[PDB]
């Protein structure tokens, strides 16, 4: 069967599923199609927020049913990355963004390869896989970028 998942803009996504599919399976499928991370994903049906462990048949979701996708992504925050040459880069970020993502964005903006990037905050070297909030990096905090070879 096929089901519909709608965003807040009315955009409709079509998913190929079985009623035995778990909700996290659906989230993973949505990741595979639209590129949206599951942790940012929140699936809602009949005014209820669906749970990762449960399946579709558990919620009595029939074929051609419509699920709504409400993202956990906030937005409204930026931070600064200061290069050793003096220039400051202003990044638009979310507290749940990984260091991997920050480095990737730095590559997207300045062309600097992530593998060469070392981000330092408060004397500590930040590690890929953790988040800005994990390091208590607030809005308008400043990070220091050093490069290697």
């Amino acid at each position: 069967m096929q089901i519909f998942v709608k965003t807040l803009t009315g955009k409709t996504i079509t998913l190929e599923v079985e009623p035995s599919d778990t909700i996290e399976n659906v989230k993973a499928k949505i990741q595979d199609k639209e590129g949206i991370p599951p942790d940012q994903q929140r699936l809602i049906f009949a005014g209820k927020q669906l749970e990762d462990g449960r399946t579709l048949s558990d919620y009595n979701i029939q074929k051609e049913s419509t699920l709504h996708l409400v993202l956990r992504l906030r937005g409204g925050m930026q931070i600064f990355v200061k290069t050793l040459t003096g220039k400051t880069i202003t990044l638009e970020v979310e507290p749940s963004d990984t260091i991997e993502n920050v480095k990737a964005k730095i590559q997207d903006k300045e062309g600097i390869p992530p593998d060469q990037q070392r981000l330092i905050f408060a004397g500590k070297q930040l590690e890929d896989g953790r988040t800005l909030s994990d390091y208590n990096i607030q809005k308008e905090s400043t990070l220091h970028l050093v490069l290697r070879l």
């Binding site: 965003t7 807040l8 803009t9 009315g10 955009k11 929140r42 809602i44 005014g47 209820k48 927020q49 709504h68 409400v70 993202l71 956990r72 992504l73 906030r74 937005g75 409204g76 925050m77 930026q78 931070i79 202003t90 638009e92 970020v93 979310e94 507290p95 963004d97 990737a104 964005k105 590559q107 997207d108 903006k109 300045e110 062309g111 600097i112 607030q138 809005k139 308008e140």
Partner: protein
């Protein structure tokens, strides 16, 4: 210093901010170009967690030719006492005195400034004056507090309206379906209080902002470039007499201001 930066050419800004060859940078460029078709300039908005409110409110007030009826209604000035007396739990909020005087002060400041800008000889004078308004962190944050309060009130109205079975915009249903946002109280505690401090506004909450200041918020989302979501509107089906303000969000993590008619 202004929380809304002086304007610079939009593609010059794009070239400055996105270099390097990655599909992301390309997408950003294509989006920025598409925006550059209808807007000449861009103004960087400060990235403190108030950014959504800052952009929407600046845009709304800088073009305001008249005081909106809802802002003019004197009953509004009685809203904090009326609302807080009814629902005690509202007494949890953030930045001798009390919450009622603070919210009333803020609402008064909002109405006063909006009305002041509205009655001025020339549009130019209004634009410059609004620029003068977003310099000082104090009056600005007072305004944002007022806006947050309006968002809360409108939210409460939607929840109450649903509970008695009245017709409501669907975003309200989706809003309260969140485990953290189940009731207006939880909305205040887990979401609104962090707005301006530890976090920004979720997309669902942008609807609430739009309904709060009664302005249609048009957003260019550059990450959405070749899709039908490239231009996203809050709310989806807006009242016809509401003014329209325009924002830009690259990756959905922040909002800046596109500009056409400037000083």
């Amino acid at each position: 210093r202004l929380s809304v930066a002086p304007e610079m050419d939009i593609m010059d800004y794009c070239k400055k901010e996105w270099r390097g060859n990655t599909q992301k940078a390309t997408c950003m460029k294509m989006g920025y170009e598409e925006v550059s078709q209808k807007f000449t300039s861009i103004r960087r908005v400060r990235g403190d967690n108030y950014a959504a409110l800052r952009a929407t409110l600046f845009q709304a007030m800088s073009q305001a030719v008249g005081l909106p009826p809802w802002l003019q209604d004197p009953e509004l000035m009685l809203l904090p006492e009326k609302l807080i007396s009814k629902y005690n739990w509202i007494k949890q909020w953030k930045l001798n005195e009390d919450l009622v005087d603070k919210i009333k002060e803020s609402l008064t400041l909002l109405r006063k400034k909006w009305a002041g800008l509205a009655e001025m000889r020339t549009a130019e004078a209004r634009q410059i004056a609004c620029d003068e308004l977003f310099t000082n962190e104090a009056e600005e944050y007072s305004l944002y507090e007022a806006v947050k309060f309006l968002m809360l009130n409108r939210a409460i109205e939607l929840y109450n309206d649903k509970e008695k079975g009245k017709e409501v915009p669907f975003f309200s249903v989706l809003l309260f379906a969140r485990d953290t946002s189940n009731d207006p109280g939880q909305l205040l505690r887990n979401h609104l209080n962090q707005v301006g401090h530890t976090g920004g506004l979720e997309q669902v909450e942008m609807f609430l902002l739009a309904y709060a200041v009664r302005h249609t918020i048009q957003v260019y989302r550059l990450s959405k470039y070749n899709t039908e979501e490239f231009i996203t509107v809050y709310p989806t089906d807006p009242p016809k007499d509401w003014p329209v303000v325009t924002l830009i969000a690259e990756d959905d993590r922040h909002y800046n201001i596109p500009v056409r008619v400037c000083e």
